[PDB]
């Protein structure tokens, strides 16, 4: 199999291919969030370059991990589907096993976790 | 069946039957129980025929394949690759194997390959399951360094006895000499060696 | 360029520039040798003393393989080391299937072809030594001497390291001389002598000999270490001939 | 304990003048328990139909596997599969399983739309293919089959005629079979039309 | 050892950019133009194969358009023999839904699996990616009819009208002057052949340079149905609309 | 050891070039032409038989090769690389097909097969791609008879008439003013001798050309009889004596 | 420039690593020849032991594949002895599979095909050796098949390989253009050796000892090489007319 | 089943009976159990008749690739090996048991393999529930130096003893004939010595006669246009 | 150069110079002396810290009751290998009921080091041993190199200025090896051999590691106060 080591230190105690992950992240359309006393809202910018759209079918910015937990992104968009597939099903997983919804911030720790394992595997951006 | 192998003056000869069965049937009354592995390396098989069949064809293949880098095997080194295959296999096989064979340094030499595994170089064998009639007579009239002649009749008169009784083993008796003088098949039908 | 750069890359010459850059590790060793003599064969080894504190007779270079080939090398010490690993299982493998001791000729080949195979890919790299070996079979007695690159042939006399080429004429002249042949015997005085002689190369530093023979008569074809009074009369010989 | 046997059913096939005719009973079973009186065994590929036989679970597997591979094939293909073809495919897809084999007896029944020639053809659980001339039976009842067909059976028989003496054979068998039954459907299959009729028979 | 020679198929760049992707792209702007249309009792799908010849067998011949299944079609632009593997993996997805939920899949579950294959080729395996655009057009009782695109990178998005291959930058505005909500599938048909018509590189649009398709329910009754025009439908569907 | 080139050796360029691709595509340009046309009731595929020595017995190589008996290739570009895909195409329409369905695959199928086969090298790690294209010439009952080109990039093309390798360009110039669709295998056949030897420069003979056909069926190449649906082989190669006869009235 | 450190195309479409291994081919300068008689195949190579210290009988590059089919290697030793190892191991399992002895021709594609691949997969260099196997084949009759780095093999009627075979070949052929058939006719295989000697010397324009020469011999049912001694009666034979 | 195979002057003759079993009941009354591996190395198969078909058709495919491959006619010693490594492999679970025969470029050659692997030379042999009646004829009959026409006589008089004689063995004798130089003709049907007889009564039904609850047209067509 | 990319990589002059690095690492570490008798075979360490609230880095390991080592270099590396030998010398044990040989230990470091310098996307290790032991054979001490090169000795030094301690250790050579049967001296002539080395700073209690291992002596490290009779 590819083994090769792709994220790698440089002599200044950077890595690279995790910062340049990030000017991935500052082109991607804006995401925000705010917090109230009993809600939360997730606010997201379409960019209006893309006109006779349909919709109805375009996958949406936000989506649902759980019924209870919601996820948006910024950056490449074919990679949050992965990182939000992986999510919903540890999201049933933890369910299944611990009989009790994610806490947001373990979904939090294991979405974060999968990201970092991502920067110390070989053969994977 | 009944399979033979003997050591003389000039060489070594190969006995065998050719009765082949299925039970009470005998679905090849003209078997060739003797086959070769090399040039002047025979044996002579016993116990199943799909068994002894393809062991045959692999040791064949084994010095064919030595043959080609290290030069004409020993009679020993062909024995070792029979029992190799024999004893590693064993709970999925049933073959009883008397390698012989002739070099011109070592003459004539015999191995026996019971069941097992275990080799047993022997001035002659004797194997199959009409052996066990003729263990009496062979050790009684084997001398070693007979001639060519002596050794012929020793095994006709054997196998004829081994014939008589068992009922696994019948047809014609197969021999085959190796000596430095090359390799002679020999057959002798019923008419000739009943009435021995 | 950069065609020396990874091996197994041909350069427009046809050339694998890494396996003769082993070939430097190897001139750059101690000198080793090889005699055939009538029944058998003769190892010698040039062993260089780097200090006083070597604990003298300790420090083995020859090396066995089987019961009847012996295995002498120069250039990087623990290559040869893994080389002759190899020709043990391989020694071991042949005499479980085929019963025999290995030949020395299908032993020769077994070396050859696994000292080849590392010149076939960039994932390896090259043997940094030339290996000196043989012994008695059934067919009498061998001597081979196999390079980096995988080639290898018989020889009557063999010689390799820093003084290979003093080595090499001293082995010629054996070979005019004595075209009847040589003793097992004479031929361990012989080799005592040619590595003295080849000590001129590594004048520096003193150091310490060390024989081997396989002789049908001498050794009843096994391999064994020259020792004791046969190793004194062997320096002995070899001192009253520089001087 | 033997799974050809738990479920119950039989298939019935047969050859006519330019046509062919394939039938089947509607009993699902659980040994002696009668669970269900609406399962079909007999499926269709574009022009080509196959019914099976044996233990339920694997006809339905089956079913939905050659549909899958019928599908395929005409994607690459851009066309229908012709039943020589298709039998064809049925065989390789049982022999594959050799020693893990799906307990059905699958009978393939249509006419090849080129040639015009009417086509039957039956199959042991693991590939066998017996390509009959005059009918083809498979089921708990296949022995019952046999006798009616091999005694009712003429050849060159009319559309409206085979389906008598199809009919026949199928029902008369099965009310000798305890776990064939409960129901029954007849296919007249024409080269370019086809009528399906569900028979009127004892309920027991 | 090997890495000497290896190229990192699946690197970003110091802008955060995926090398391989956008060269991918590049590659698929020289492929010839394929559009969707989608309307209000259809979708149309036409496509213009490059610079052919007189003794190329049209009609057995088939480099654009292609049936992934009954509800779902494609058309291609790029490499035919990177987007055949790619057809075939869908064709198989299809048929394992299929078999699973006894249901025809749904398109937009389709077109997220072929989307997902994609984007392994930019993260993982150092391989390269497949150069290869699609445009989806597909019906099912959810969404109805429904037209979408994915790219190298694995990113895909629904649309009322696109194109994909050479010259999409004019044929999208042309599109996006003429195309209405109330439009009807003889009015697409009508839009996507002037489009090509205008767009393309050759000197004038005959029969033996398309490919073209529909997606309708006027099947009889609630059914759709595929049709994948013949050389001669195409011949006679220019002449209608007026531009042979 | 171990094969440790699990990345992709052909890649994009800034230009969305595949450079090897390419390259293979250059390769297959400095091959020996060959061509193929498509008759009404017949397909005919030729090439010369480049000797790289008189020494050397130029029958023994085969430049024209059966894949299935209503199949039939030809290539231009590098041989070796065309014998392995002759042989990993023989087996695939095997182990692919008619162990699955009991017949010959179609030649469309086939030729989809071997493009797969193709377009893997160009994608898979730690290889090249095949430096060929071939002329695949074959009939079935549904297709009827068809003639296709299958290229390094794995893509493949349908033709009434084509030509590939050396003098490609003049060739198919010369195929379009001869072709028609009223064609009998013969008039294909003296077409293709006269557009290959335009190209070819020594010795014009049945010894210098290799020539084949997929046209009817070959009853009496069978080698056996009793039963009637089979009735033989539409591929044929054509002898030197064949080709010869067709070479005075030329 | 890396493609020309692996087998992959350059822009001319050339692979440089398979072009730079038909010249690691002549490194050993040693020249070899074939030829077919009527009931015999006959392959001649010459032989140089430089080194006094070398034992000669071990120096050799004519391999006994089987029993009838032999091989002779223009190339680095290594690499010769590489290919007849695996030609060994490919005609024992060839024999064991399929129930008869491999054909020359066909060992001769099998060793193509790998030397294909060893063009085509990367980590794989290719063998820096051109193997001509000889046999009476069976069903052929004398057979003459040759292989390349390429992977480019064919049949010959007669055949040269080293430095100087282009004199040898034309050499060949002009007798070939004399005699208007396609191999020796001679009734003994001794005579066939004294042709292929006799014509590598005419064409080389060098004399030859019994150990300047290597001779392989290829009849019915076996393939032998001859020793020293015999190489000798066939010298004294060409001297004498 | 009854399977032969019997040599002769200038070639081989095979044989065999057409009736397949399931238990007691017939399952095919005219069953083909003469296997074409190439076209000049036809085999007999009995036993399992999935095994023998498939067993066949996988050394025939790999005969046909084989011989593609070496550009030479394939050999019967081939199919003999390539068979018998594959059933010793499978230890006897593949029941296939052949009667393996043909002509090459060596000459005319026939061969028996069994389902553990085991093979066997002859000039005149049988296999299959019915063996024991039809080599009761063979060594009878059999003699040396055979014609074309007493060979294919002595072959068919052995299956028709299986026929008559054995429950296993019925209805019609295939046949096929592999000479040197010649091609291999198959006798389909080369006897049918078990025709049924008519029957004495009609079975035809009146139409009506089926008492029905439904009908309606099936839709074998595809989705239409417009 | 352009040759010391990778360890699979000879230069011109047939030199590796990966495994030269992982030598220039050895060199860096600090002092470790070995020296024996005919009774015993002692090792002497210092050991070094990295500043004045942390403690000193260990030297030695024990790898059984009659075998062990001292290091000089990267100190996981000495782990990994010391793991190694601790299970050699178990296998040994369990399978045999041997004691394994002192200069057998020495072959399966050698073979172990050789390994990781003829393959690619591995490294050379990057520690240098000393091996003492007392087996059949009598007392034993060893010297490991990570290019794989072993050799046995009567006494060696490694590390940072060990030519000071391999100077004294050659010319005491005749005196050091004749005292049998007196651990004290010997463990004197190593300590006042170490010292040879030492420059600004001096032999301290918590400086200083020594071990031990003889004819009736199991090896034993002394560290602490129980170094403190030797200073
Ligand atoms: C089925 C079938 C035919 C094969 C019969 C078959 O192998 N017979 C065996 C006896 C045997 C052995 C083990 C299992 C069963 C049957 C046989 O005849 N052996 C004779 C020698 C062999 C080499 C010919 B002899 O030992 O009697
Ligand atoms: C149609 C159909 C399925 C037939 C089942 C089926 O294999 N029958 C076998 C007998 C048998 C075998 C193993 C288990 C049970 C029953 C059979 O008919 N064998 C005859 C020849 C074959 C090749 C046609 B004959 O050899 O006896
Ligand atoms: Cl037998
Ligand atoms: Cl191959």
Request: with cysteine; hydrophobic share 35%.
């Amino acid at each position: 199999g590819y083994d090769r080591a792709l994220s790698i230190f440089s002599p200044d105690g950077h890595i690279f291919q995790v910062e340049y992950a990030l000017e991935a992240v500052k082109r991607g359309t804006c995401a925000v969030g705010v917090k109230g006393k009993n809600c939360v809202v997730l606010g997201c910018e379409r960019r209006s370059t893309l006109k006779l759209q349909d919709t109805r079918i375009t996958p949406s910015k936000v989506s649902k991990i759980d019924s209870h937990v919601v996820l948006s992104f910024s950056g490449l968009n074919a990679d949050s589907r992965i990182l939000i597939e992986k999510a919903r099903v540890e999201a049933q997983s933890h369910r299944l096993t611990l009989e009790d919804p994610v806490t947001v911030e373990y979904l939090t720790r294991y979405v974060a976790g999968v990201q970092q394992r991502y920067t110390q595997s070989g053969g994977v951006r | 069946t009944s399979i033979m192998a003997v050591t003389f003056k000039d060489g070594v000869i190969l006995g065998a039957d050719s009765r082949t069965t299925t039970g009470a049937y005998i679905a090849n009354r003209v078997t060739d129980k003797l086959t070769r592995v090399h040039d002047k390396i025979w044996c002579c098989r016993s116990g199943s025929a799909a068994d002894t069949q393809a062991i045959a064809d692999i040791v064949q293949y084994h010095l064919e394949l030595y043959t080609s880098q290290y030069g004409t095997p020993s009679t020993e080194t062909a024995a070792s690759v029979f029992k190799e295959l024999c004893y590693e296999n064993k709970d999925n096989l049933t073959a009883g194997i008397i390698v012989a064979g002739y070099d011109d340094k070592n003459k004539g030499e015999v191995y026996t390959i019971p069941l097992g595994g275990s080799v047993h170089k022997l001035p002659y064998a004797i194997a199959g399951s009409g052996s066990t009639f003729i263990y009496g007579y062979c050790d009684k009239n084997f001398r070693e360094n007979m001639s060519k002649e002596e050794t012929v009749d020793f095994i006709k008169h054997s196998l004829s006895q081994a014939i008589k009784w068992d009922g696994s083993s019948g047809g014609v008796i197969r021999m085959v000499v190796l000596t430095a003088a090359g390799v002679e098949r020999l057959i002798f039908y019923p008419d000739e060696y009943e009435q021995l | 360029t950069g065609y020396d750069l990874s091996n197994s890359v041909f350069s427009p010459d046809g050339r694998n520039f890494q396996v003769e850059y082993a070939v430097k590790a190897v001139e750059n060793g101690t000198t080793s040798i090889g005699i055939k003599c009538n029944d058998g064969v003769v190892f010698a080894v040039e062993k260089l003393i780097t200090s006083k504190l070597l604990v003298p007779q300790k420090n083995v270079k020859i090396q066995v393989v089987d019961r009847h080939i012996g295995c002498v090398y120069s250039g990087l010490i623990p290559d040869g080391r893994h080389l002759v690993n190899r020709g043990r299982e391989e020694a071991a493998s042949f005499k479980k299937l085929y019963k025999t001791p290995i030949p020395i000729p299908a032993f020769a080949d077994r070396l050859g072809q696994y000292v080849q195979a590392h010149t076939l890919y960039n994932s390896v790299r090259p043997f940094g030594v030339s290996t000196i070996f043989g012994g008695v079979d059934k067919n009498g007695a061998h001597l081979y001497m196999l390079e980096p690159s995988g080639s290898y042939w018989g020889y009557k006399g063999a010689a390799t390291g820093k003084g290979r080429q003093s080595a090499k004429a001293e082995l010629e002249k054996l070979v005019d001389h004595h075209p009847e042949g040589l003793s097992a015997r004479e031929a361990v005085k012989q080799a005592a002598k040619i590595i003295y002689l080849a000590h001129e190369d590594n004048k520096e530093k003193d150091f310490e000999l060390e024989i081997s023979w396989c002789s049908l008569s001498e050794t009843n074809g096994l391999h064994k270490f020259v020792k004791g009074d046969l190793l004194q009369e062997a320096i002995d010989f070899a001192q009253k001939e520089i001087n | 304990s033997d799974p050809s046997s738990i479920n119950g059913g039989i298939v019935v096939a047969m050859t006519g003048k330019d046509c062919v005719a394939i039938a089947c009973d509607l009993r699902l079973g659980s040994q002696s328990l009668g669970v269900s009186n609406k399962f079909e065994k007999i499926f269709h590929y574009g022009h080509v139909f196959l019914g099976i036989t044996g233990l339920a679970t694997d006809v339905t597997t089956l079913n939905e596997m050659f549909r899958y591979k019928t599908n395929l094939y005409k994607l690459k293909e851009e066309r229908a599969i012709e039943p020589e073809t298709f039998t064809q495919l049925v065989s390789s897809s049982l022999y594959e399983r050799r020693f893990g084999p799906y307990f059905v007896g699958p009978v393939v029944a249509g006419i090849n739309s080129k040639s015009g020639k009417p086509f039957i053809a039956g199959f042991d659980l693991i590939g066998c293919i017996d390509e009959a001339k005059d009918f083809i039976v498979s089921g708990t009842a296949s022995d019952q089959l046999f006798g009616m067909c091999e005694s009712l059976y003429e050849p060159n028989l009319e559309p409206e005629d085979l389906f008598e003496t199809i009919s026949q054979a199928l029902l008369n068998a099965a009310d000798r079979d305890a776990l064939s039954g409960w129901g029954a459907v007849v296919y007249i299959i024409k080269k370019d039309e086809v009528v399906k009729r569900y028979l009127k028979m004892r309920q027991d | 050892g090997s890495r000497r020679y290896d190229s990192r198929t699946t690197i970003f760049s110091p802008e955060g950019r995926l090398y391989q992707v956008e060269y991918a792209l590049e590659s698929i702007s020289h492929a010839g133009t394929a559009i969707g249309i989608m309307a209000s009792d259809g979708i149309v799908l036409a496509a213009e194969r490059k610079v052919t010849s007189t003794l190329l067998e049209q009609d057995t011949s088939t480099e654009k358009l292609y049936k992934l299944n009954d509800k779902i079609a494609v058309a291609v632009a790029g490499l035919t023999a990177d987007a055949e593997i790619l057809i075939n993996t869908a064709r198989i997805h299809a048929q394992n839904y299929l078999k699973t939920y006894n249901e025809d899949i749904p398109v937009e579950i389709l077109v997220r699996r072929l989307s997902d294959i994609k984007q392994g080729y930019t993260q993982h395996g150092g391989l390269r990616p497949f150069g290869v655009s699609f445009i989806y057009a597909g019906y099912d009782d959810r969404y109805g009819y429904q037209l979408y695109t994915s790219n190298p990178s694995g990113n895909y998005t629904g649309w009322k009208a696109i194109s994909v291959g050479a010259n999409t930058s004019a044929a999208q505005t042309l599109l996006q002057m003429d195309y209405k909500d109330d439009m009807k599938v003889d009015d697409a048909i009508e839009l996507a052949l002037k489009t090509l018509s205008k767009t393309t590189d050759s000197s004038a649009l005959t029969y033996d340079r398309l490919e073209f398709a529909t997606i309708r329910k006027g099947a009889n009754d609630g059914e759709v149905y595929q049709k994948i025009f013949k050389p001669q439908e195409i011949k006679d569907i220019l002449v209608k609309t007026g531009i042979t | 050891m171990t094969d440790r080139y699990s990345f992709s050796l052909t890649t994009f360029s800034p230009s969305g070039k595949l450079g090897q691709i390419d390259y293979a595509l250059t390769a297959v340009k400095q091959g020996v032409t060959s061509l193929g046309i498509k008759a009404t009731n017949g397909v005919v595929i030729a090439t010369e038989k480049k000797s790289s020595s008189p020494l050397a017995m130029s029958e023994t190589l085969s430049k024209v090769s059966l894949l299935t008996p209503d199949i039939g290739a030809v290539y231009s570009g590098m041989g070796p690389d065309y014998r392995v895909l002759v042989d990993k195409s023989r087996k695939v329409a095997h182990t692919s097909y008619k162990r699955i369905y009991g017949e010959y695959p179609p030649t469309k199928l086939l030729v989809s097969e071997v493009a797969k086969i193709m377009q893997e090298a160009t994608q898979s790690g730690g290889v090249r791609p095949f430096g060929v294209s071939l002329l695949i010439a074959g009939h079935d009952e549904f297709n009827g008879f068809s003639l296709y080109q299958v290229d390094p990039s794995g893509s493949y093309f349908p033709w009434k008439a084509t030509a590939i390798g050396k003098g490609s360009v003049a060739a198919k110039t010369f195929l379009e003013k001869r072709w028609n669709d009223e064609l009998e295998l013969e008039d294909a056949i003296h077409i293709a001798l006269l557009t290959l030897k335009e190209s070819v420069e020594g010795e014009f003979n049945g010894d210098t050309i290799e020539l084949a056909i997929i046209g009817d069926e070959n009853p009496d190449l069978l080698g056996y009889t009793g039963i009637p649906t089979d009735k033989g082989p539409r591929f044929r190669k054509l002898t030197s004596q064949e080709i010869n006869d067709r070479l005075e009235a030329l | 420039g890396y493609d020309r450190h692996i087998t992959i195309f350059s822009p001319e479409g050339r692979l440089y690593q398979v072009e730079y291994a038909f010249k690691a081919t002549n490194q050993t300068n040693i020249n070899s020849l074939a030829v077919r008689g009527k009931d015999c195949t006959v392959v001649i190579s010459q032989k140089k032991v430089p080194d006094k210290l070398l034992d000669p009988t071990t120096v050799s590059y004519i391999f006994c594949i089987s029993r009838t089919i032999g091989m002779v290697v223009n190339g680095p030793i290594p690499d010769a002895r590489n290919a007849a190892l695996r030609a060994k191991a490919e005609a024992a399992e060839f024999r064991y599979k399929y129930g008869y002895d491999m054909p020359c021709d066909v060992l001769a594609k099998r060793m193509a095909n790998l030397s294909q691949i060893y063009t085509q997969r990367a980590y794989m260099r290719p063998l820096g050796v051109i193997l001509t196997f000889v046999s009476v084949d069976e069903e052929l009759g004398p057979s003459i098949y040759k292989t390349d780095p390429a992977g480019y093999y064919v049949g010959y009627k007669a055949t040269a390989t080293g430095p100087k075979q282009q004199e040898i070949t034309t050499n060949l052929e002009n007798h070939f253009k004399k005699s208007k058939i396609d191999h020796i006719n001679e009734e003994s295989w001794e005579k066939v050796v004294e042709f292929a000697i006799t014509h590598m010397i005419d064409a080389l324009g060098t004399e030859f000892s019994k150990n300047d020469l290597e001779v392989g011999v290829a009849t019915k049912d076996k393939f032998f090489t001859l020793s020293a001694e015999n190489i000798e009666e066939r010298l004294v034979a060409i001297a004498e007319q | 089943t009854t399977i032969v195979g019997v040599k002769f002057n200038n070639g081989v003759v095979i044989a065999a009976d057409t009736r397949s079993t399931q238990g007691p009941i017939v399952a095919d009354k005219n069953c083909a159990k003469l296997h074409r591996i190439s076209p000049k190395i036809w085999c007999a198969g009995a036993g399992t008749a999935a095994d023998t078909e498939a067993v066949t058709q996988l050394i025939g495919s790999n005969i046909e690739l084989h011989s593609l491959y070496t550009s030479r006619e394939p050999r019967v010693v081939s199919a003999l090996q390539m068979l018998k490594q594959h059933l010793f492999k499978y230890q006897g679970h593949i029941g296939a048991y052949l009667i393996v025969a043909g002509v090459d470029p060596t000459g005319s050659h026939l061969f028996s393999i069994h389902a553990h692997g085991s093979t066997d030379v002859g000039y005149y042999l049988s296999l299959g529930s019915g063996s024991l009646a039809a080599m009761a004829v063979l060594e009878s009959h059999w003699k040396q130096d055979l014609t074309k026409e007493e060979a294919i006589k002595l072959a068919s008089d052995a299956i028709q003893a299986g026929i008559w004689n054995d429950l296993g063995s019925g209805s019609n004798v295939d046949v096929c004939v592999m000479e040197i130089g010649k091609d291999a003709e198959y006798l389909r049907n080369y006897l049918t010595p078990n025709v049924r007889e008519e029957k004495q009564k009609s079975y035809k039904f009146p139409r009506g006669t089926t008492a029905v609850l439904k009908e309606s047209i099936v839709n074998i067509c595809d989705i239409q246009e417009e | 150069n352009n040759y010391d990319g990778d360890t699979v990589t000879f230069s011109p002059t047939g030199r590796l110079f990966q495994v030269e690095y992982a030598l220039e690492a050895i060199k860096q570490g600090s002092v470790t002396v070995g020296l024996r008798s005919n009774t015993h075979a002692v090792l002497v360490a210092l050991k070094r810290n990295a500043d004045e609230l942390s403690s000193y880095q260990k030297k030695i390991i024990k790898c059984d009751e009659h075998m062990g080592l001292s290091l000089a270099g990267l100190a996981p590396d000495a782990r990994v290998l010391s793991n190694y030998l601790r299970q050699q010398c178990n296998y040994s044990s369990l399978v045999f009921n041997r004691k394994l040989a002192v200069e057998r230990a020495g072959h399966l470091l050698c073979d172990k080091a050789q390994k990781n310098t003829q393959s690619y996307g591995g490294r050379p290790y990057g520690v240098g041993l000393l091996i003492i032991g007392y087996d059949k054979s009598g007392a034993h001490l060893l010297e490991f190199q990570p290019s794989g090169n072993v050799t046995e000795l009567y006494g060696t030094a490694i590390g940072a200025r060990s030519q000071g301690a391999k100077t004294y250790l050659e010319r005491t050579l005749d005196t050091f090896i004749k005292i049998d049967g007196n651990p004290d001296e010997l463990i004197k002539a190593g300590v006042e051999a170490i010292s040879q080395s030492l420059r600004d700073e001096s032999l301290t209690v918590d400086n200083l590691s020594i071990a031990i291992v003889g004819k009736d002596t199991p090896f034993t490290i002394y560290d602490g106060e129980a170094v403190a009779k030797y200073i």
